[PDB]
Amino acid sequence: GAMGSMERASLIQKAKLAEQAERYEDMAAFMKGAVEKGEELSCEERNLLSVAYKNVVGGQRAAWRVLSSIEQKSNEEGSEEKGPEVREYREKVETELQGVCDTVLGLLDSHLIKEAGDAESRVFYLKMKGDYYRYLAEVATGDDKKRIIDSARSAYQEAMDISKKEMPPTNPIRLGLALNFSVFHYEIANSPEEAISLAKTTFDEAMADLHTLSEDSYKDSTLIMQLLRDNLTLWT
């Protein structure tokens, strides 16, 4: 509601409570309010923002995929009487999903990307911009789709450029970015060769420097490396 007047620390505390209660829509709203206080986010706070919106859009994406499958199965069967209800409800869920993505992209543009001090946080936010354009691309059709795809690619490419100049190959943000850009290539851009090449290079270069990884980020980085491996197995 009137989050402008709320203490930033209270908004963060409420985000943490919402997380514990598995109330992700509330959690996201609290973190949006915290962002709008106009200060940079810490690591913990970036994680709260990410977890909240990823859970919200995650639910929407799952629902959309179910409905899209039903819609297509109905249309394939081609019965003179079925299909309009599922189309309309798929469109309703789609519109809600697009609204959440637009909210996230708005916060990135209005508050987060420009105002990041360091390379790590700048790359994190550009990755996030790539991700939410990618989620828009999943449901986009026609010409609008080409523009959305281009926006995702541009964001990911800028993030990749910075990460390669500024961050070690085993950094969790750099790894998560590379993983997601490879997914973009495979699932969105119909570019399996680039997906495989990026995933393979990322995996190998991370493994080559694994002996230098701090124990603090070891868990997260090795998890991403496993997902790179899993995708590579799926794609080949």
Binding site: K54, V183, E187, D220, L227, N231
Partner: peptide
């Protein structure tokens, strides 16, 4: 049978 992207942590 979709590709895996980065998960939520912590």
């Amino acid at each position: 049978d979709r590709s895996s992207s980065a998960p939520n942590v912590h």
